[PDB]
Amino acid sequence: KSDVFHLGLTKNDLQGATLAIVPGDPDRVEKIAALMDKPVKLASHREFTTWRAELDGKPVIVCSTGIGGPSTSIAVEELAQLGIRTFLRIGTTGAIQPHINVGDVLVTTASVRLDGASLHFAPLEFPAVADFECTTALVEAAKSIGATTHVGVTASSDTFSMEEWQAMGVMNYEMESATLLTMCASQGLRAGMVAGVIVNRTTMKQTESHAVKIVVEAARRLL
Amino acid sequence: KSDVFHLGLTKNDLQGATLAIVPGDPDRVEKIAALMDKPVKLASHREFTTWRAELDGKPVIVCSTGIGGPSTSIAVEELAQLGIRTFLRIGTTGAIQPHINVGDVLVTTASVRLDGASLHFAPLEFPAVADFECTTALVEAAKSIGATTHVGVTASSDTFYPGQERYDTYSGRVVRHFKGSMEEWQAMGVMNYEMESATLLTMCASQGLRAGMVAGVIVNRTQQEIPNAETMKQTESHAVKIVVEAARRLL
Amino acid sequence: KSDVFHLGLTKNDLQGATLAIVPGDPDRVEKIAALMDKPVKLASHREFTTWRAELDGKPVIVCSTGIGGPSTSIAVEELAQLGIRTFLRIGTTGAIQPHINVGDVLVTTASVRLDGASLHFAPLEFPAVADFECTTALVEAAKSIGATTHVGVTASSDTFSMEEWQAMGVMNYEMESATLLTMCASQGLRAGMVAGVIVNRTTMKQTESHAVKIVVEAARRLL
Amino acid sequence: KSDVFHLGLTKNDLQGATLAIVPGDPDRVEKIAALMDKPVKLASHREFTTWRAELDGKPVIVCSTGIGGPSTSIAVEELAQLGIRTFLRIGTTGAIQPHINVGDVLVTTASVRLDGASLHFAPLEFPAVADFECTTALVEAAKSIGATTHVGVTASSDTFYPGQERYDTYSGRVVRHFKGSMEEWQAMGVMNYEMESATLLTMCASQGLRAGMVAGVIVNRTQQEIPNAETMKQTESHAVKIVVEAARRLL
Amino acid sequence: KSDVFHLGLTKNDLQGATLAIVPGDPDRVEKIAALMDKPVKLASHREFTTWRAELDGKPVIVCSTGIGGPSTSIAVEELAQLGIRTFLRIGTTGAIQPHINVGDVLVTTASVRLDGASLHFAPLEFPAVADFECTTALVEAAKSIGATTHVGVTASSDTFSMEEWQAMGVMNYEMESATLLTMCASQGLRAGMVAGVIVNRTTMKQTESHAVKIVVEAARRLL
Amino acid sequence: KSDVFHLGLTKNDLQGATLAIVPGDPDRVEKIAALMDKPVKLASHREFTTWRAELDGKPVIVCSTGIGGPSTSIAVEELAQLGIRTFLRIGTTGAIQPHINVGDVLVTTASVRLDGASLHFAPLEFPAVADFECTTALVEAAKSIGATTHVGVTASSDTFYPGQERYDTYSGRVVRHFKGSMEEWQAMGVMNYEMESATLLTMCASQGLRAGMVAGVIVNRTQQEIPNAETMKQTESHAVKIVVEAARRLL
């Protein structure tokens, strides 16, 4: 029996890991893990596929979050129960700012809370802010590989106007950040987020790959 | 469109099916489909696995929704554009009422909308109500196999933990507006918590689609006695039989 | 002195009744009662006119509710204090769906909560749903007399856009259902609602009469 | 229109009256009207009973509103289309302040909007305020007959039970947001609860009409001693005298 | 050390005063004080400048409030701690009603609560109403000098549509009244407000001067 | 415009400065400016006092905001129309976390929006976030002089009393929605309360301006020991040094 309700993991599986890289789906999980040492698939239940690997001799976790705040909230809480204290989200997004180019990397400082799940953790007035160390590490890792990076606000909703968030400067949209960032910032957990710009309605697997290297390199600076 | 991104289906694959049984977990799709005739796998992507089968000669679909409102809305919407007009949610759940026993079956008339996704289809004031024909079919099917059935309100929350006022967690605490909410729902007659019915019921009720929901009770946190871990798998099979018999009546 | 603040009734008046038919005004109260056996006028205070009658040898109550949630909340609570556990609302409405015809009967499964009173009983997230047995009994009674019936959502507000609720499928509008349904569904009381379609902006006393027979026949199935 | 559906009146019946005294209960209309000159009954439908009378030679109207905001809004609106520009609400109420005694009179300056109807005339941020000339007239009239008067805020709730945090009920419970609300209103200086002033004051304040409100205190749930059941009927007569004398000054 | 966190005053400074005239800025404070007897400047810290004076032999306070609800809330609470029980606000505003003329005087009966601070004292449903005595005294003082006066609703926000509040009859806009009135009416403190109409987008220092005399004369009737 | 009403400045006075240090109190402007080169006073009206100075050869501005969001929004907006694109808020604050000591320095990453003014620039869902370059500069400057720094969330309230759940007041009470709020913010990791950052951060984050915030801790209401009343003035100087060094890096 695992120590958690959904992930199907026990504390021993993590072998002392305190950091987890949290992408959306299993395919990406394996990709991330494959960049690191001693990659081992630990469990797979529903949307939650967890691998374990090592960075500079220290164990790190990679675990899929599924779609939306709801599913993210489960993986995040269960990983925290298992000992994870630092969470780094990696994804691919579409930018909505004309000065942002495909291939560029977006580091979220905070999210527009347009979801439902974030509210189960804090009133709307509480900001969905990324941890400073985590954001720093991500910005430095991106710089380390010559990526063009934008650091700012991301809009996060439960749905899969554009003009208003664009005037407010929001760089892009996605569905899980408000939850991740809020639940971490309101519980003493550190979270950060990086996304590769694969489209801009205002070349593509390379971007994802470059985003994957960047989350891994940020992790190395955070352990 | 004639195909859909997430499910990976074309309309032709459905052979004109207009009813779908929607469990949450893709691993339970094949088993529900196997209960009917000519079961065949159509696709499988992410947590969206769908099979087709025949019931009384009519094509029927079984497709998993994954966890949560957002994931569920993507499934329903795609199935809807593929021709599905009737959705039967089948699940396993915990109960929050003392008089409800593991092995009992819950049929949901409407849900408390503690989610985000449902709000994109209708404002909060709109009820996350289940279609009467669907509810009727599900209740009569449960009565057919002699199940003990509870018909009422379900609370649909975007979280498994704080929204269901669980304190067995990393923080050990729950945000203000949720503190004491479980007791309120209980005193108000809510049968159980789950996470997808708010978006499913609201989407369908607001878009002229029929949706209904049944679930077997596998645990009860208000009861001291723990499930028979026997009676649990029996309950899941039980629920599956119910939802299939209900589809039979909605063809 | 009555046992209640407004209805002017004592528990004995109900003679053990546990079901009440709740129309809006006194004129309709007498009409309903007159369909049943041993009809007796019990009290009349302000908007609240209560008769007692018998259905298949069992006593039933008929009591006017007045206008809106506020007044309904009073009659409903006081009837509950007196022992009523099942409430059936009967009214006449205007439909807003093109496929609904005058003369048709509308059975509400749940209401759009646009009132104020419903909130004094439960947060807006709680659904204003009709009890399943009550809805069933109403649908069966309508069928028993060959009525064309529609079963769905009703919009309920305190005011005496149309296009939006029409696209959401709401069948019609009225002012008391959100309160009735919410206060009953959140307190273990059973409620159901039926209305005769007397207009459709998208023959008339017969409709009301047919709605009256239907609520009475549903009551018979619920006792 | 030249007639109105609910009240059953034509403009001519009012003989150019522009002031109306609006009690809640139709059975108290005749008695208020009888205090003035040439009292005549005009109509009576549902809980809407109206009489006309003369005060200092000017036609004045008395019309009941029935119970609740929705019923009240129908009365005010119709009277307004018939030419009424000044409304004086007269009532009997309970108090929630210990220093307020049965037999005392309350004149309302503004109301806490715990209702639904008022929101159709102005957003919550708008104050349910009473017209200054009306309030002035009512306060000076109370002082004229030597009443003990309290001038302040009234809480106007859509329910008699949970909204006034009554626990003497079928359920014995009150929804979250209302739990402890009575104590808050008290500490904030609210004098009493009633059910119609929010819609009356907001309608009038937002539509350039004058409205004012007076009520006699017939009970006090914070006091142990029960009313003299003598002093109660005296209080109602008392209030009636006040509202009539106030109309006298607003002609 | 003062008895309060911001005003820099001790209870003795007030010499028993229980009434305070509360304008927005220090310049106006001196003007008001100068109308009275024995005017003495007591303190000046940040936005808060307090003078003490006498009206008909009784001590009265004049204290600037600064800009907005936030700053007003501080002066109001601290003055209350020091013993003030009656607060009279004086300002100059722009009217938005065509029938209101420059030079006219506006006495607020209640405010549209469009600010943030008022909510820290009471839920939005609670009315931001002026005390009856205070409003009376102000109306009588205005009448005493032949001023054309309007008594009604004022819109109060944190920002430095017009058409909607105009149809609702609101006479004008300002930023501090919702806070003043709400915090006083919800704590047993008496508050009133008068403003001189210096503009009407629908001669000028005289108006202010006439508004100043009026607040002072109202104070005299309230002590 | 080429001038601004409230600050009393023309664009030329700023000599092309695009960065401003914004303390709250005008009496602290000269001292911050004196730390840099060629300090000169430009204006002084109400609580809006501004000086100009040079840092590493570049003109820089120092301007006080006064107390509260509304007053702050007027300052920022005017400075913005005069060419300022980078704002560094410098202040003194109390802490609400036991592990935070007087003399420590707080650098704010984002604020809980408990105010009214911020809402005019963006809806509540928008985060009152600080610009990353500004935050970075402030954190590295604090590390430069060896300060003990805390980087996190600040609660920005429209009141000093009820919004910071102070019970040491005239009423001795706090409105419902604020009762127990202090403990929630604490458990959620909020470092301190202040009153202007919500509007400053939201304005800038939503308008493509950079803003950052640092403050020295001069008190701690969760600690029994009272400040050294020595270490307090040292803390203010400390914070001033930090914000100046941070500007140095943002030129």
Coordinates of N, CA, C and O in Angstrom, one line a residue, chain D residues 16-132:
Chain D
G16 N -55.6 63.0 -7.4 CA -54.3 63.8 -7.4 C -53.5 63.6 -6.1 O -52.7 64.5 -5.8
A17 N -53.8 62.6 -5.3 CA -53.0 62.4 -4.1 C -51.5 62.1 -4.5 O -51.3 61.4 -5.5
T18 N -50.6 62.6 -3.8 CA -49.2 62.3 -4.1 C -48.4 61.7 -2.9 O -47.2 61.5 -3.0
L19 N -49.1 61.6 -1.8 CA -48.5 61.0 -0.6 C -49.3 59.8 -0.3 O -50.6 59.8 -0.3
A20 N -48.6 58.7 0.1 CA -49.3 57.5 0.6 C -48.6 57.0 1.8 O -47.4 57.0 2.0
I21 N -49.5 56.5 2.8 CA -49.1 55.8 4.0 C -49.2 54.3 3.6 O -50.2 53.9 3.2
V22 N -48.1 53.6 3.8 CA -48.1 52.2 3.4 C -47.9 51.2 4.5 O -46.8 50.8 4.9
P23 N -48.9 50.7 5.1 CA -48.7 49.7 6.2 C -48.6 48.4 5.4 O -48.8 48.4 4.1
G24 N -48.2 47.4 6.1 CA -48.0 46.1 5.5 C -49.3 45.3 5.3 O -49.5 44.6 4.3
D25 N -50.2 45.4 6.3 CA -51.3 44.5 6.5 C -52.6 45.2 6.0 O -52.9 46.3 6.6
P26 N -53.3 44.7 5.1 CA -54.6 45.4 4.6 C -55.6 45.6 5.7 O -56.4 46.5 5.5
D27 N -55.6 44.9 6.8 CA -56.6 45.0 7.9 C -56.3 46.3 8.7 O -57.1 46.6 9.5
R28 N -55.2 46.9 8.5 CA -54.9 48.1 9.2 C -55.0 49.3 8.4 O -54.9 50.4 8.9
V29 N -55.5 49.2 7.2 CA -55.6 50.3 6.3 C -56.8 51.2 6.7 O -56.7 52.4 6.9
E30 N -58.0 50.6 6.8 CA -59.2 51.3 7.2 C -59.0 52.1 8.4 O -59.3 53.3 8.5
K31 N -58.4 51.5 9.5 CA -58.1 52.2 10.7 C -57.2 53.4 10.6 O -57.5 54.5 11.2
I32 N -56.2 53.3 9.8 CA -55.3 54.5 9.6 C -56.1 55.5 8.8 O -56.1 56.7 9.2
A33 N -56.8 55.1 7.8 CA -57.6 56.0 7.0 C -58.7 56.7 7.8 O -58.9 57.9 7.7
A34 N -59.3 56.0 8.8 CA -60.4 56.5 9.6 C -59.9 57.7 10.5 O -60.8 58.4 11.0
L35 N -58.6 57.7 10.7 CA -58.1 58.8 11.5 C -58.2 60.1 10.8 O -58.2 61.2 11.4
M36 N -58.3 60.1 9.5 CA -58.4 61.3 8.7 C -59.8 61.6 8.2 O -60.7 61.0 8.6
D37 N -59.9 62.6 7.3 CA -61.2 63.0 6.8 C -61.7 62.3 5.5 O -60.9 61.8 4.7
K38 N -63.0 62.2 5.4 CA -63.7 61.6 4.3 C -63.1 60.3 3.8 O -62.8 60.1 2.7
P39 N -62.9 59.4 4.7 CA -62.2 58.1 4.4 C -63.1 57.3 3.5 O -64.2 57.1 3.9
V40 N -62.6 56.8 2.4 CA -63.3 55.9 1.4 C -62.5 54.8 0.9 O -61.3 55.0 0.7
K41 N -63.1 53.6 0.8 CA -62.4 52.5 0.3 C -62.4 52.6 -1.3 O -63.4 52.8 -1.9
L42 N -61.2 52.4 -1.8 CA -61.0 52.3 -3.2 C -60.9 50.9 -3.8 O -61.6 50.6 -4.8
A43 N -60.0 50.1 -3.3 CA -59.9 48.7 -3.8 C -59.4 47.8 -2.8 O -59.0 48.2 -1.6
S44 N -59.4 46.5 -3.2 CA -58.9 45.5 -2.3 C -58.8 44.2 -3.2 O -59.7 43.6 -3.7
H45 N -57.5 43.9 -3.4 CA -57.1 42.7 -4.1 C -55.9 42.1 -3.5 O -54.9 42.8 -3.3
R46 N -55.9 40.8 -3.3 CA -54.8 40.1 -2.6 C -54.6 40.9 -1.3 O -55.6 41.2 -0.6
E47 N -53.4 41.3 -1.0 CA -53.1 42.0 0.2 C -52.9 43.4 0.0 O -52.4 44.2 0.8
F48 N -53.4 43.9 -1.2 CA -53.3 45.3 -1.6 C -54.7 45.9 -1.4 O -55.6 45.8 -2.3
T49 N -54.8 46.5 -0.3 CA -56.0 47.3 0.0 C -55.7 48.7 0.1 O -54.7 49.1 0.8
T50 N -56.4 49.5 -0.6 CA -56.2 50.9 -0.5 C -57.4 51.8 -0.3 O -58.5 51.4 -0.8
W51 N -57.3 52.8 0.6 CA -58.3 53.7 0.9 C -57.8 55.1 0.6 O -56.6 55.4 0.5
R52 N -58.7 56.1 0.4 CA -58.3 57.5 0.2 C -59.0 58.2 1.3 O -60.0 57.9 1.8
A53 N -58.3 59.3 1.7 CA -58.8 60.2 2.7 C -58.4 61.6 2.5 O -57.6 61.9 1.5
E54 N -58.8 62.6 3.4 CA -58.3 63.9 3.3 C -57.7 64.4 4.5 O -58.2 64.1 5.5
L55 N -56.6 65.1 4.4 CA -55.9 65.6 5.5 C -55.7 67.1 5.2 O -55.1 67.4 4.2
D56 N -56.2 68.0 6.1 CA -56.1 69.4 5.9 C -56.6 69.8 4.5 O -56.0 70.7 3.9
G57 N -57.6 69.1 4.0 CA -58.1 69.4 2.7 C -57.4 68.7 1.5 O -57.9 68.8 0.4
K58 N -56.4 68.0 1.7 CA -55.7 67.3 0.6 C -55.9 65.8 0.6 O -55.8 65.2 1.5
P59 N -56.1 65.3 -0.6 CA -56.3 63.8 -0.7 C -55.0 63.2 -0.3 O -53.9 63.6 -0.7
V60 N -55.1 62.1 0.4 CA -54.0 61.2 0.9 C -54.4 59.8 0.6 O -55.7 59.5 0.6
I61 N -53.5 58.9 0.4 CA -53.8 57.5 0.2 C -53.2 56.6 1.2 O -52.2 56.9 1.8
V62 N -53.9 55.4 1.5 CA -53.3 54.4 2.5 C -53.4 53.1 1.7 O -54.5 52.8 1.3
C63 N -52.3 52.4 1.6 CA -52.3 51.2 0.8 C -51.3 50.2 1.4 O -50.2 50.6 1.7
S64 N -51.8 49.0 1.6 CA -51.0 47.9 2.2 C -50.0 47.4 1.1 O -50.3 47.3 -0.1
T65 N -48.9 46.9 1.6 CA -47.8 46.4 0.7 C -47.7 44.9 0.7 O -47.2 44.3 -0.2
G66 N -48.3 44.2 1.7 CA -48.2 42.8 1.9 C -46.9 42.4 2.5 O -46.2 43.3 2.9
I67 N -46.5 41.2 2.6 CA -45.3 40.8 3.2 C -44.1 40.6 2.2 O -44.3 39.9 1.2
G68 N -43.0 41.2 2.5 CA -41.8 41.0 1.7 C -41.5 42.0 0.7 O -42.4 42.7 0.2
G69 N -40.2 42.0 0.2 CA -39.7 43.0 -0.8 C -40.5 42.9 -2.1 O -40.8 43.9 -2.7
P70 N -40.6 41.7 -2.7 CA -41.3 41.6 -4.0 C -42.7 42.2 -4.0 O -43.1 43.0 -4.9
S71 N -43.5 41.7 -3.1 CA -44.8 42.3 -2.9 C -44.9 43.8 -2.6 O -45.7 44.5 -3.2
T72 N -43.9 44.3 -1.8 CA -43.8 45.7 -1.6 C -43.4 46.5 -2.9 O -43.9 47.6 -3.1
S73 N -42.5 45.9 -3.7 CA -42.0 46.6 -4.9 C -43.2 46.8 -5.9 O -43.3 47.8 -6.5
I74 N -44.0 45.7 -6.0 CA -45.2 45.8 -6.8 C -46.2 47.0 -6.3 O -46.7 47.8 -7.1
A75 N -46.4 47.1 -5.0 CA -47.2 48.2 -4.5 C -46.6 49.6 -4.8 O -47.3 50.5 -5.3
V76 N -45.3 49.8 -4.4 CA -44.7 51.1 -4.6 C -44.7 51.5 -6.1 O -45.1 52.6 -6.5
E77 N -44.2 50.6 -6.9 CA -44.1 50.9 -8.3 C -45.5 51.3 -8.9 O -45.6 52.3 -9.7
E78 N -46.6 50.6 -8.5 CA -47.9 51.0 -9.0 C -48.4 52.3 -8.5 O -48.9 53.1 -9.2
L79 N -48.2 52.5 -7.2 CA -48.6 53.7 -6.6 C -47.8 54.9 -7.3 O -48.3 55.9 -7.6
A80 N -46.5 54.6 -7.6 CA -45.7 55.6 -8.2 C -46.1 56.0 -9.6 O -46.2 57.1 -10.0
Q81 N -46.6 55.0 -10.4 CA -47.1 55.3 -11.7 C -48.5 56.0 -11.6 O -48.9 56.6 -12.6
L82 N -49.1 55.9 -10.5 CA -50.4 56.6 -10.2 C -50.2 58.0 -9.7 O -51.2 58.6 -9.4
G83 N -49.0 58.4 -9.5 CA -48.7 59.8 -9.0 C -48.1 60.0 -7.6 O -47.8 61.1 -7.2
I84 N -48.0 58.9 -6.8 CA -47.4 59.0 -5.5 C -45.9 59.3 -5.6 O -45.2 58.6 -6.3
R85 N -45.5 60.3 -4.9 CA -44.1 60.7 -4.8 C -43.5 60.6 -3.4 O -42.3 60.7 -3.3
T86 N -44.4 60.5 -2.4 CA -44.0 60.4 -1.0 C -44.6 59.2 -0.3 O -45.8 59.1 -0.3
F87 N -43.8 58.3 0.2 CA -44.3 57.1 0.9 C -43.8 57.1 2.3 O -42.6 57.2 2.6
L88 N -44.8 56.9 3.2 CA -44.6 56.8 4.7 C -44.9 55.3 5.1 O -46.1 55.0 5.3
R89 N -43.9 54.5 5.4 CA -44.1 53.2 5.9 C -44.4 53.3 7.4 O -43.7 54.0 8.1
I90 N -45.4 52.6 7.8 CA -45.8 52.5 9.2 C -45.8 51.1 9.6 O -46.4 50.3 8.9
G91 N -45.2 50.7 10.7 CA -45.3 49.3 11.1 C -45.1 49.1 12.6 O -45.0 50.0 13.4
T92 N -45.1 47.8 13.0 CA -44.9 47.3 14.3 C -43.7 46.4 14.2 O -43.6 45.7 13.3
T93 N -42.8 46.5 15.2 CA -41.6 45.7 15.1 C -41.0 45.2 16.4 O -41.4 45.6 17.5
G94 N -40.1 44.3 16.3 CA -39.4 43.8 17.5 C -38.1 44.6 17.6 O -37.7 45.1 16.6
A95 N -37.5 44.8 18.7 CA -36.2 45.5 18.8 C -35.1 44.5 19.2 O -35.4 43.4 19.7
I96 N -33.9 44.8 18.8 CA -32.7 43.9 19.2 C -31.7 44.7 20.0 O -30.6 44.2 20.2
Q97 N -32.1 45.8 20.6 CA -31.2 46.6 21.5 C -31.9 46.7 22.9 O -33.1 47.0 23.1
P98 N -31.1 46.3 23.9 CA -31.6 46.2 25.3 C -32.1 47.5 25.8 O -33.1 47.4 26.5
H99 N -31.6 48.6 25.4 CA -32.1 49.9 25.9 C -33.4 50.4 25.2 O -33.9 51.4 25.5
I100 N -33.8 49.6 24.2 CA -35.1 50.0 23.5 C -36.2 49.2 24.2 O -36.2 48.0 24.4
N101 N -37.3 50.0 24.5 CA -38.4 49.4 25.2 C -39.7 49.3 24.4 O -39.9 50.0 23.4
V102 N -40.5 48.3 24.8 CA -41.8 48.1 24.1 C -42.5 49.4 24.3 O -42.4 50.0 25.4
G103 N -43.2 49.9 23.3 CA -43.9 51.2 23.4 C -43.0 52.3 22.9 O -43.5 53.3 22.6
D104 N -41.7 52.1 22.7 CA -40.9 53.1 22.1 C -41.2 53.1 20.6 O -41.9 52.2 20.0
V105 N -40.7 54.1 19.9 CA -41.0 54.2 18.5 C -39.6 54.3 17.8 O -38.7 55.0 18.3
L106 N -39.5 53.7 16.6 CA -38.3 53.7 15.9 C -38.5 54.4 14.6 O -39.4 54.2 13.9
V107 N -37.6 55.4 14.2 CA -37.7 56.0 12.9 C -36.3 55.7 12.2 O -35.2 55.8 12.8
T108 N -36.5 55.1 11.0 CA -35.4 54.5 10.3 C -34.7 55.5 9.3 O -35.4 56.1 8.5
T109 N -33.4 55.6 9.5 CA -32.6 56.5 8.7 C -32.1 55.8 7.4 O -32.0 56.4 6.3
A110 N -31.8 54.5 7.5 CA -31.3 53.7 6.4 C -31.4 52.2 6.9 O -31.5 51.9 8.0
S111 N -31.4 51.3 5.9 CA -31.5 49.9 6.2 C -30.3 49.0 5.7 O -29.8 49.3 4.6
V112 N -30.0 48.0 6.4 CA -29.0 47.0 5.9 C -29.8 46.2 5.0 O -30.9 45.7 5.3
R113 N -29.2 46.1 3.8 CA -29.9 45.4 2.7 C -29.7 43.9 2.6 O -28.9 43.4 1.9
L114 N -30.4 43.2 3.4 CA -30.4 41.8 3.5 C -31.5 41.2 2.7 O -32.2 40.2 3.1
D115 N -31.7 41.7 1.5 CA -32.9 41.2 0.7 C -32.4 41.0 -0.8 O -31.3 41.3 -1.1
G116 N -33.4 40.5 -1.6 CA -33.1 40.4 -3.0 C -33.7 41.5 -3.9 O -33.1 42.0 -4.8
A117 N -34.9 41.9 -3.5 CA -35.7 42.8 -4.4 C -35.0 44.2 -4.6 O -35.0 44.7 -5.7
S118 N -34.3 44.7 -3.5 CA -33.7 46.0 -3.6 C -32.6 46.1 -4.7 O -32.4 47.1 -5.2
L119 N -32.0 44.9 -5.0 CA -30.9 44.9 -5.9 C -31.3 45.1 -7.3 O -30.5 45.3 -8.2
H120 N -32.6 45.1 -7.6 CA -33.1 45.3 -9.0 C -33.2 46.8 -9.2 O -33.4 47.2 -10.3
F121 N -33.2 47.6 -8.2 CA -33.2 49.0 -8.3 C -31.9 49.7 -8.2 O -31.6 50.7 -8.7
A122 N -31.0 49.1 -7.4 CA -29.6 49.7 -7.3 C -28.7 48.7 -6.8 O -29.1 47.8 -6.0
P123 N -27.4 48.7 -7.1 CA -26.4 47.8 -6.7 C -26.2 47.9 -5.2 O -26.6 48.9 -4.6
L124 N -25.7 46.9 -4.5 CA -25.6 46.8 -3.1 C -24.9 48.0 -2.5 O -25.3 48.5 -1.3
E125 N -23.9 48.6 -3.2 CA -23.2 49.7 -2.7 C -24.1 50.9 -2.4 O -23.7 51.8 -1.7
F126 N -25.3 51.0 -3.1 CA -26.2 52.1 -2.9 C -26.9 52.0 -1.6 O -27.4 50.9 -1.3
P127 N -26.9 53.0 -0.8 CA -27.6 53.0 0.5 C -29.1 53.0 0.5 O -29.7 53.8 -0.3
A128 N -29.7 52.1 1.3 CA -31.1 52.1 1.4 C -31.5 53.2 2.4 O -31.8 52.9 3.6
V129 N -31.3 54.5 2.0 CA -31.5 55.6 2.8 C -32.9 56.2 2.7 O -33.5 56.2 1.6
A130 N -33.4 56.8 3.8 CA -34.7 57.4 3.9 C -34.5 58.9 3.6 O -33.5 59.5 3.8
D131 N -35.6 59.5 3.0 CA -35.6 60.9 2.6 C -35.5 61.7 3.8 O -36.2 61.5 4.8
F132 N -34.7 62.8 3.8 CA -34.5 63.6 5.0 C -35.8 64.4 5.5 O -36.0 64.5 6.7

